[PDB]
Scaffold this active site. Structure first.
Site, PDB file in Angstrom:
ATOM      1  N   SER A  97     -70.091  46.812 122.230  1.00 32.10           N
ATOM      2  CA  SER A  97     -69.812  47.069 120.808  1.00 32.10           C
ATOM      3  C   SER A  97     -71.015  47.692 120.100  1.00 32.10           C
ATOM      4  CB  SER A  97     -69.332  45.794 120.082  1.00 32.10           C
ATOM      5  OG  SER A  97     -68.827  46.073 118.769  1.00 32.10           O
ATOM      6  N   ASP A 237     -68.298  51.778 114.792  1.00 32.31           N
ATOM      7  CA  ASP A 237     -69.121  51.172 115.829  1.00 32.31           C
ATOM      8  C   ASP A 237     -68.812  51.772 117.208  1.00 32.31           C
ATOM      9  OD1 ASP A 237     -66.693  49.806 116.271  1.00 32.31           O
ATOM     10  OD2 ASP A 237     -67.585  47.805 116.342  1.00 32.31           O
ATOM     11  N   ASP A 239     -67.421  50.966 120.077  1.00 32.32           N
ATOM     12  CA  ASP A 239     -66.101  50.821 120.696  1.00 32.32           C
ATOM     13  C   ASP A 239     -64.977  51.082 119.693  1.00 32.32           C
ATOM     14  OD1 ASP A 239     -66.750  48.416 119.374  1.00 32.32           O
ATOM     15  OD2 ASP A 239     -65.558  47.217 120.749  1.00 32.32           O
ATOM     16  N   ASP A 241     -63.529  49.764 117.127  1.00 30.21           N
ATOM     17  CA  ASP A 241     -62.564  48.865 116.502  1.00 30.21           C
ATOM     18  C   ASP A 241     -62.944  48.478 115.081  1.00 30.21           C
ATOM     19  OD1 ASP A 241     -64.660  47.200 117.296  1.00 30.21           O
ATOM     20  OD2 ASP A 241     -63.356  45.796 118.408  1.00 30.21           O
TER      21      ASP A 241
HETATM   22 MG   LIG Z   1     -66.647  46.801 117.865  1.00 31.00          MG
END
Ligand SMILES: [Mg+2]
Length: 448
Positions: A97, A237, A239, A241
């Protein structure tokens, strides 16, 4: 003790002492024992170690007779989407992340992308891994490469009416994480003019780790918006999400206000729907949901709580002030893509700037943002606060930490269960002075 990499909602740890290939393989074996029948979806982010950790996970799963569907380099939400879309037994995203270079981790889901959390299988997996001294078996099942993103892209696009979109100029800042790949795949189907910042995936992170909350990283998006006269800016960020918004002035938008704004956008599509929200900051969300004809549903903060509440209520949307937005049609999962599509459509249809949309709500419900306090004794600190305000007889709610409603202002205080740390949020009814005096008062009490 226990393996430190296993946290409340996921696996996060320093490589290679807290997380490594052997642990990843053992996690794969353990996960196979925890899931109902079916194949398992695997995806990974841009970190340099992620492919090897995924391969080890795959090896463990396949040794246990699980067919693996490798969706390759992706965002976390793609593992959620594909797990549900492909009717898989479960899924794992390998991702660090927003964490430092020496860290990695995993997010695990079961059928319909339902979360696997500490009390819903993740600590069972931990204990199995911890006791696993067996030699690695050989694969008894296949791995298939399935990198087609068409169904995912079509799903994203289904949230907006493309004929109503205007050619907004949007700054997009992937932070050298994975978001840019999806933006580029969506772009031919959208009228927007994209201004790409830190766009190329690069796990060496030449421009810093992908975390838009850091003022230095925030400023790259803000500067691009201002210098290019963009309608707004979006950053993610690593990744992707979580997404983060900047208005045309370059101002970073506090996440609280996005919950009410996204609720407005969704309720226009699904009239009378329920909207789940968290207890930290609430007044603006309740008002915006109700004025848009929806029904707000208070829920404890936390990934699993929000999703479970949405499921039980058939809620169309759920949002947290901390940049997590969940959508019923998206397997009740969070997306960092759906929110900016909805906001771009709202700006396009309404003729209102993001700045104007946010400013109006900020004036009505000024908030402190979340402020963290490391303390010697969380219980003693909370007591000092409660004692101090007792004479005012606030209305108290213990849904999540302590919420205290004084009429024209309120606060929420939550205590970490992993370290002595209190988190404070304060808001008022249109009174910036009261916000500051009460915030400073509580801050003094927490510290002293
Ligand atoms: Mg994330």
């Amino acid at each position: 003790m226990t393996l430190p990499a296993f946290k409340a909602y996921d696996i996060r740890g320093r490589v290679p002492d807290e997380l490594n290939e052997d642990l990843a393989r053992r996690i794969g074996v353990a996960l196979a024992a925890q899931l109902d029948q079916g194949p398992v979806v695997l995806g990974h982010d841009v970190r340099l170690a992620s492919p090897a950790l995924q391969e080890a996970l795959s090896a463990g799963l396949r040794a246990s007779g699980r067919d693996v569907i490798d969706i390759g380099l992706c965002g976390t939400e793609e593992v959620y989407f594909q797990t549900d879309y492909l009717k898989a037994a479960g899924g794992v995203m390998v991702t660090a992340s927003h964490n430092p270079m020496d860290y990695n981790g995993m997010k695990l889901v079961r059928e319909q992308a339902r979360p696997i959390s500490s009390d819903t299988g993740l600590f069972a997996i931990r204990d199995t891994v911890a006791a696993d001294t067996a030699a690695p078996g050989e694969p008894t099942a296949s791995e298939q490469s399935r990198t087609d993103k068409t169904a995912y892209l079509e799903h994203l696009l289904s949230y907006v009416d493309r004929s109503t979109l205007k050619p907004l100029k949007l700054v997009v800042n992937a932070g050298n994480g994975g978001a840019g790949l999806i933006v580029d795949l969506l772009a031919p189907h959208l009228p927007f003019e994209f201004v790409r910042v830190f766009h190329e995936p690069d796990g060496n992170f030449p421009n810093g780790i992908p975390n838009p909350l850091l003022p230095e990283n925030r400023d790259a998006t803000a500067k691009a918006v201002k210098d290019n006269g963009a309608d707004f800016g979006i950053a993610w960020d690593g990744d992707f999400d979580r997404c983060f918004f900047f208005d045309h002035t370059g101002r970073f938008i506090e996440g609280y206000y996005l919950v009410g704004l996204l609720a407005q956008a969704i309720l226009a599509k699904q009239p009378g729907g329920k909207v789940v929200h968290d207890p930290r900051l609430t007044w603006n969300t309740v008002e915006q949901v109700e004025e848009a004809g929806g029904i707000p549903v208070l829920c404890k903060s936390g990934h699993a709580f929000i999703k479970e509440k949405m499921r039980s209520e058939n809620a169309v949307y759920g949002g947290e002030m901390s940049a997590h937005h969940y959508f019923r049609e998206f397997a009740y999962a969070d997306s960092g893509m759906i929110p900016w599509l909805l906001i771009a459509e709202l700006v396009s249809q309404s003729g209102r700037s993001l700045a104007d949309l946010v400013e109006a709500r900020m004036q009505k419900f000024p908030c402190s943002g979340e402020i963290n306090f490391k303390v010697a004794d969380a219980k003693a600190s909370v007591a000092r606060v409660m004692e101090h305000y007792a004479s005012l007889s606030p209305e108290l709610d213990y849904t999540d930490g302590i919420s205290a409603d004084f009429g024209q202002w309120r606060f929420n205080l939550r205590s970490s269960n992993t370290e002595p740390l209190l988190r404070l949020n304060v808001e008022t009814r249109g009174d910036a002075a009261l916000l500051e005096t009460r915030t400073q008062e509580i801050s003094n009490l927490l510290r002293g």
